[PDB]
């Protein structure tokens, strides 16, 4: 069977194990720094297997040796934000955690595809690629799938249609300057502008950018995990099943969109080899302007990163 | 449980029972004019239930009384074409069969949504609405979902991407003058023209229009059933689960696109109440020209219909 | 669509919503007394729908009016236990909570099947039946499905076989005195005693009885929720899809197994009408002695309850 | 991705592809000797993928070279029987077909697990093992899963319970002499004898034995394929996902049940390595007498085979 290791067994990591288990994609290893917690969550989920009918070994551990030879490594060990904070405010604590986790896991699974989740996403993904030394196509960050999912959900709710018929591309860094692309969003191939008024669509674009913060303010003691885990699981599935999915993920740019040496949310074809192709869309002046402002925000986090 | 009756237990009807059973949407009644055949197919499929794990009663019958109080009626009793024929060539034989089936089933399930499949689709759907006297929104024809699925498949194959990320709208009568709409087709919200060259996309549009005939010429003894059944099942699912799907189905027009008193392949929101809304797309001159040529072909079949 | 209301949006409640949404069984209403929490978890789960592909309306609320006319009501509002604590220790606190919830929800959904989860399970289910005034067969408690799932997981691990081929019955109150039944345990119809030696099987039985405590000790801050939620969801599903599942649940007894006027873990047929029939197994002397011991335990908590 | 080759694109073969595609287990290659037929069914099934949402490459062919390096090979190229005919009557025709297929496919996929379906099952599986020269544990026949499924369906119908809670073992050759085992039949761990009276259970056992004939008489033009295909697919799945399923299949015996040098229906653990272990049930006098009768039947066909 395929092997998937999830580093960090908190809200997002455990929920990610849940989505993956139900899919019977492969055996799962939940690792954490806290003793007992990952073992308990993995056993609890494993005990659900006879009810749901999936044959997947789910095991909790505190030892990186158990993650050896994984096909995919998911990183969800970062600290989450609380109300009033930005994802960037977590960069110091999480840079340390990320370096720690990647330095230990990466060497044990040299052929794995690493999927970063820790925030600030784009910067943490860059760090992981550096600490691991893995081919850039095998180190990606999850962010766009979740952001576009929030957008797609708001459209479905607004238009009163099935979430199964809404598609949307969203680019940029996983933050406030995120760039949802209405012009690149459709319902069964039909432009969303044909279903929703411009002013209303504008409010949806804004709600999408502040979507993470909306949940943080509701939960008050933590951030989102159901959709984030689903998004991560979808990317894991893309790799394990070599589905060649077209989705936005933080990938390493070498000139696309006029950007070099940076991890940025861009449309890619994701498969068994990780990022198999970075797509270069014909954005207009307004879109490019928003994208550049996003690339600037991301570069800003990378500059903070290098000063740590 | 919900009840679904499938009139005509041949290739498309039985395959449709298969797709539906696996979804555990409701009990299924397979009716046919031939004795034994529907009973055998329904029992064979029912015996697969312990293996797959679905609890759905699947029963074969030769008596319309068994289809009483169905939530959805699927009609697949028409004769299929052989190599060298057009769907229109079946209108005489199938007009009789359709009238026969609808006159018997419709009265027994007054609250059902009828989904026609018999070819020529648009004309047979018009006939069914007339013979049944049901509210027009509850009498629809399956055709666009299948046509757009063939198109979406060719795009996925051509672009080398996941079929899960391809969306496409296709309009018109279910025939040679069918109108696939490249401008209304995307991959994760991105126009298909960004993935495929115009000349290649043109060949795909053509293959889509002649897609049914392609299979007929390969099988030689019959026509397609796997995709047609999937398409039909998806529409059944849309109604039973009130999913508000946006898909192209033959619906009754009263002025949309400048067309009145005709069943034509158009984009609709499909739910528990059947067609809950007919969408009017801003087609350009070239598209409207193709659509009108299609509306003309359909009107031609309706004129043949009235002379029977 | 069917409507499911979950009272108590904590670990089990929210996780049950997750399992339920993935099955697209109906719209879900997550209610809690803490403001924002349910709204946040519901929105988060909702935003995952475009990724997973399920059309389910998940709404969080602090108002019981929103639960009106539900097909099923799940009660997961009770306080969980902390390490070194027995489920019975929660009786006073959870009796007040359970009473408050049932009294506000029952009147608004008179035709609903109530599934209790709050511990001590058996006594809370009884309290629910008494507060709702509902037909006894429409007020049941989840416990046996979870306990049996743990038991099945253990034997699957021990024997090295698929969890899909392991079934087992388990009876009694949800506590240390529960009674797993090895004699009524099989692997593809074959007695488990053929796969696991008596000594090891005895250990598995003991682990099952202490299974809940095992998780609480590992997590230290709370109790299990992945399997507990999957169990609750399988019961909700049995009801909504009228599957006629044969499973152990807490049902009201009037003489079965020689027990009367008590909610106790017994095998039943679960369907749209709730408990449609209580099965009466031919237990031997060994098993009955265990069952009677468990009954005395449940009776004791019932005595504590009636005296609160 | 995993690769599955189906030799014989008829009713069972094509239907197996359908069940397999829906599970997204791997790419499927449908091979047939008749030109166009496999290509047509494959394309048709492929065109259904955008509707169902599975990324599976289904290719039809008339060239064995395309089956090279498959993980699993399904053999469904045998001629089916017509009413008033026994499965044994197909031995000469199907021996030539089976021989021709195996000799061309085996060499190209030396690491594959071969699953025989052609009737007479037991004798064809033996012939396959002898022609391929493969390890006996990697050449098995489908029969018991189907027979047991029918038996389980009947008891589910009779008892009025979910097909998900019914398990049963069945042994022996795939024919009139097959041996269902009521003693090794349970409903959620409870003996079926507790649900169905002896007289009725005896009728169910008889129906199971004649189950295949029942379908052939109803269809008149061919034999079953929905359950047969689901059975074959569950076995393919057990192998590809290394599930360790406990199921009856035709395996090579070297003394188990006192039988040697014969492929016979026995319970096994099925996983990535094929038959990983043959279970030896403690059968009583009644059961062994039946098993020995069945063994003599299979041996007889084996005698006919070796003398062809
Ligand atoms: N779209 C996205 O990219 C996205 C979405 C949601 C959350 N996130 C981010 O993901 C991270 C996880 O969020 P969460 O809510 O699951 O948090 P959490 O606090 O629930 O879980 C993090 C887990 O990591 C563990 N941990 C800490 N240091 C570790 C180390 N060195 N090694 C192994 N495990 C360690 C903790 O003990 C904890 O169980 C946060 O940084 C959050 O902001 C990103
Ligand atoms: N996209 C579409 O709309 C679409 C796709 C595929 C096929 N079709 C059409 O659907 C029909 C069915 O195709 P098929 O391949 O399943 O054909 P088929 O010949 O396999 O099956 C038709 C079944 O109808 C039964 N039948 C005939 N008269 C009947 C009557 N009066 N009452 C009840 N049953 C009766 C037959 O006995 C037969 O079993 C054809 O007309 C075909 O062209 C439409
Ligand atoms: N029967 C079983 O098999 C089983 C399995 C697991 C847990 N349980 C029990 O289920 C209960 C819930 O466990 P948990 O881990 O989810 O706990 P939790 O503390 O995470 O969640 C309980 C939720 O109830 C809410 N709540 C409290 N009073 C309320 C009221 N009056 N109305 C509405 N909501 C209210 C809280 O605010 C909280 O969100 C516990 O009593 C636990 O012991 C039973
Ligand atoms: N073991 C079971 O439980 C079970 C269940 C059902 C059917 N069967 C048996 O399975 C076989 C297939 O049944 P069916 O209903 O699908 O039959 P079918 O006639 O529909 O299909 C057989 C296919 O094999 C093809 N074929 C013939 N010779 C070939 C060769 N040399 N190479 C490649 N393809 C070749 C045919 O052209 C045809 O498409 C029969 O022998 C039947 O008795 C076994
Ligand atoms: O807002 C957060 O902190 C986490 C969810 C996200 O990254 O969108
Ligand atoms: O071509 C046919 O006759 C049937 C398939 C379709 O209607 O596309
Ligand atoms: O032990 C607990 O408190 C919860 C899980 C269970 O009831 O098994
Ligand atoms: O009876 C037949 O020929 C095929 C079905 C089976 O083998 O059961």
**A94 assigned binding-site residue:** yes
Order of all β-strands in the sheet with D179-187: D166-171, D179-187, D190-191
Say if A1-143 and A144-304 have the same CATH topology: no
Contact across the interface for A55 and D1, Cβ inside 8 Å: no
Burial class (CB in 10 A: 0-12, 13-18, 19+), D240: buried
Whether ligand 4 lies within 6 angstroms of the CB of D248 is answered as no
Cβ atoms of residues A131 and A106 within 8 Å: yes
Pocket test for ligand 3, best of C10, C13, C95, C176 (most atoms within 8 A of CB): C10
Which residue blocks in chain D are alpha helix, DSSP H?
11-23, 37-46, 49-52, 91-105, 121-132, 144-159, 198-219, 226-240, 285-306
Query: Which distant-in-sequence residues (6+ apart) come within 8 Å of C158 by Cβ?
Result: C195, C196, C200, C204
How many CA atoms are closer than 13 Å to the CA of C302, on its beta-carbon side?
A: 19
Nominal resolution in Å?
1.9
Which homologous superfamily does the CATH classification assign to the domain defined by B1-143?
Answer: NAD(P)-binding Rossmann-like Domain (3.40.50.720)
Chain A: partners with 3+ C-beta pairs within 8 Å: B, C, D
The residues near A300 (Cβ < 8 Å, ≥ 6 apart) are none
For the CA of B212, the closest atom of ligand 6 is 1
Which residue has the CA at smallest separation from atom 5 of ligand 8? Answer: D212
CB contacts under 8 A, A 32-51 vs B, are none
Catalytic site residue from C102, C174, C205, C215: C174
Active site residues of D: 174
Instruction: Give A207 to chain C, closest Cα distance, Å.
Output: 12
Please name the member of C24, C241, C244 whose beta carbon is closest to the beta carbon of B241.
C24
Q: How far is the CA of C223 from the centre of ligand 7 (A)?
A: 6
Shortest Cα distance, chain C CAs vs residue D282, angstroms: 9
Q: Is C150 annotated as a binding residue?
A: yes
Experimental method: X-ray
Give the residues across from B251 on adjacent strands. Answer: B264
Using the mean position of ligand 3's atoms as its centre, give its distance from the Cα of residue B248 in Å.
46
Q: Is the Cβ of D272 closer than 8 Å to some Cβ of chain C?
A: no
Residue C118 annotated as lining a ligand binding site: yes
Distance CA(D153)–CA(B47), nearest Å, equals 6
User: Is A119 assigned a ligand-binding role in the annotation?
Assistant: yes
Q: Is B181 in Cβ contact with A247 (below 8 Å)?
A: no
Distance (Å) from the alpha carbon of D240 to chain A's nearest alpha carbon: 9
Q: Which residue has the tokens 């990163």?
A: A305
Q: Is D186 on the interface with C (CB under 8 A)?
A: yes
The reply to whether residue C48 touches residue A220, judged by beta carbons under 8 angstroms, is no
Judged by phi (left if over 0) then psi (alpha if -120 to 50, else beta), residue C220 lies in left
- Within 13 Å, how many C-alpha atoms sit on residue B40's CB side? 20
**Cβ-based contacts of D227 with chain B (< 8 Å):** 44-45, 47-48, 51
Q: How many CB pairs under 8 A join B and C?
A: 12
Does D269 touch chain C if contact means CB atoms closer than 8 Å? yes
- Residue B137 is classified by DSSP as G
Q: From the alpha carbon of D81, which atom of ligand 4 is closest? A: 43
Q: Contact at 8 Å (CB) between B81 and B61?
A: no
**Number of Cβ atoms within 10 Å of the Cβ of D280:** 12
Q: Do residues C99 and C278 lie in contact, with contact meaning Cβ atoms separated by under 8 Å?
A: no
Alpha-carbon span B132 to B128, nearest angstrom: 6
Site from B55, B164, B238 to mutate, C interface, most C CB atoms within 10 angstroms: B55
With a CB-CB cutoff of 8 Å, which residues 101-140 of chain D face chain B?
Answer: none
Contact list, A24 vs chain D (CB under 8 Å): 241
Asked if the Cβ–Cβ distance from D165 to C282 is below 8 Å, we say: no
Search chain B and give the residue with CA nearest C23.
B23
Closest by CA position to B301, among listed B114, B58, B141, B119? B119
Q: Which alpha helices (DSSP H) does chain C contain, by range? A: 11-23, 37-46, 49-52, 91-105, 121-132, 144-159, 198-219, 226-240, 285-306
Which residue is closest in CA terms to ligand 6's atom 6?
Answer: B212
Ligand whose nearest atom lies closest to the CA of A116: 1
Are B1 and C241 an interchain contact pair (Cβ–Cβ within 8 Å)? Answer: yes
B174 among known catalytic residues: yes
| In chain D, where the domains are located | 1-143, 144-304
- Cβ of A24 within 8 Å of Cβ of D242? The answer is no
| Cα–Cα distance list, B214 to B207, B211, B231, D167 (Å) | 8, 5, 18, 44
CA angle D277, D282, D285 (to 5 degrees): 135
Give the separation between CA D298 and CA D302, rounded to whole angstroms: 6
CA dihedral B24, B28, B32, B34 (to 10 degrees): 80
How far apart are alpha carbons A291 and C190 in whole angstroms? 63
Q: Of B186, B135, B168, whose CA–CA distance to B248 is shortest? A: B168
8 Å CB contact between D253 and D266: yes
Alpha-carbon distance of C290 to C288, in angstroms, equals 5
Topology at the third CATH level for domain C144-304: L-2-Hydroxyisocaproate Dehydrogenase; Chain A, domain 2 (3.90.110)
* DSSP per residue, chain A: --EEEEE--SHHHHHHHHHHHHHT-SEEEEE-SSSSHHHHHHHHHHTTHHHHT----EEEES-GGGGTT-SEEEE--SPPP-TT--GGGGHHHHHHHHHHHHHHHHHH-TT-EEEE-PSSHHHHHHHHHHHH---GGGEEE--HHHHHHHHHHHHHHHHT--GGGEEEEEES-SSTT-EEEEEEEEETTEEGGGTS-HHHHHHHHHHHHTHHHHHHHHHSSS---HHHHHHHHHHHHHHHTT--EEEEEEEEEESGGG-EEEEEEEEEEEETTEEEEE------HHHHHHHHHHHHHHHHHHHHHHT-
Per DSSP bridges, beta strands D166-171 and D179-187 are antiparallel
**Widest CA span of chain D, in angstroms?**
55
- Ramachandran region, residue D62 (left: φ > 0; alpha: ψ -120 to 50; beta: rest): alpha
DSSP codes joined into one string, D149-184 = HHHHHHHHHHHT--GGGEEEEEES-SSTT-EEEEEE
- Report the C-alpha gap between D73 and D64 in whole angstroms: 12
Contact check, Cβ <8 Å, C246/D161: yes
Chain B residue closest to D15 (CA)? B15
CA of B215 to the centre of ligand 3 (A): 57
Which residue's entry shows tokens 């979870």?
C146
Which residue owns the Cα nearest ligand 6 atom 1? B212
Whether the CB of D21 is below 8 Å from some CB of chain C: the reply is: no
Between the CA of A223 and the centroid of ligand 5 the distance, in Å, is 6
Residue of D nearest to C245 (CA): D162
B33 CB under 6 A from ligand 2? yes
Q: Which chain D positions have a beta carbon within 8 Å of A238's beta carbon?
A: none
Ligand nearest to the CA of B95: 2
Q: Whose CA is nearest to atom 39 of ligand 3?
A: C10
CA distance B150 to D47: 5
User: Any residues with CB less than 8 A from the CB of B79 and at least 6 apart, and which?
Assistant: B90, B93, B94, B97
Distance A51 CA to ligand 3 centre (A): 21
* Binding-site annotation, residues of B for substrate: 81, 87, 119, 150
Q: Is A183 flagged in the annotation as binding?
A: no
- The catalytically annotated residue of B174, B186, B192, B248 is B174
How would DSSP label each residue in D119-152? Answer: SSHHHHHHHHHHHH---GGGEEE--HHHHHHHHH
C16, two tokens: 């049950």
Q: Which two tokens stand for residue C76?
A: 């997961």
* Distance (Å) from CA D13 to ligand 4 centroid: 7
> By the CB < 8 Å criterion, does B289 face chain A?
no
Q: Do C243 and B55 touch (CB under 8 A)?
A: yes
Verify whether the Cβ–Cβ distance A168 to B161 is below 8 Å. no
Tell if the CB–CB gap between A145 and C226 is shorter than 8 Å. no
Q: Whose CA is nearest to atom 6 of ligand 2?
A: B228
User: What are residue B186's DSSP bridge partners?
Assistant: B167, B191
Residue nearest to atom 8 of ligand 7 (CA): C212
Residue numbers in B near D220 (CB within 8 A) = 36-37
């Amino acid at each position: 069977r395929k092997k998937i290791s999830i580093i960090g067994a908190g809200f997002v990591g455990s929920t990610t194990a849940h989505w993956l288990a139900a899919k019977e994609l492969g055996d799962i290893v939940l690792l954490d720094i806290v003793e007992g917690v990952p073992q308990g969550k993995a056993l609890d989920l494993y005990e659900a297997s006879p009810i749901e009918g999936f044959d997947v070994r789910v095991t909790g551990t505190n030892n990186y040796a158990d993650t050896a030879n994984s096909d995919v490594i998911v990183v969800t060990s970062g600290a989450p934000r609380k109300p009033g904070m930005s994802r960037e405010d977590l960069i110091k604590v999480n840079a340390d955690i990320t370096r720690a986790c990647i330095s230990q896991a990466a060497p044990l699974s040299p052929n794995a595809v690493i999927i970063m989740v820790n925030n600030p996403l784009d910067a943490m993904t860059y760090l992981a690629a550096e600490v691991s030394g893995f081919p850039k196509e095998r180190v990606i960050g999850q962010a766009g799938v979740l952001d576009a999912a929030r957008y797609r959900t708001f459209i479905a709710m607004e238009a009163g249609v099935s979430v199964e018929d809404v598609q949307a591309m969203l680019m940029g860094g996983h933050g406030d300057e995120m760039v949802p692309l209405p012009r690149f969003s459709t319902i069964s191939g039909i432009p969303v502008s044909e279903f929703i008024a411009p002013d209303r669509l504008a409010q949806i674009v804004e709600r999408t950018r502040k979507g993470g913060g909306e949940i943080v303010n509701l939960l008050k003691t933590g951030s989102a995990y159901y959709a984030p885990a689903a998004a991560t699981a979808q990317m894991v599935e893309a790799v394990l099943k070599d589905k060649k999915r077209v989705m936005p993920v933080a990938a390493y740019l070498t000139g696309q969109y006029g950007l070099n040496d940076i991890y940025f949310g861009v449309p890619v074809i994701l498969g068994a080899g990780g990022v198999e192709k970075i797509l270069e869309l014909p954005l207009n002046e307004e879109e490019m302007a928003l994208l550049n402002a996003s690339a600037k925000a991301v570069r800003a986090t990378l500059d903070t990163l290098k000063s740590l």
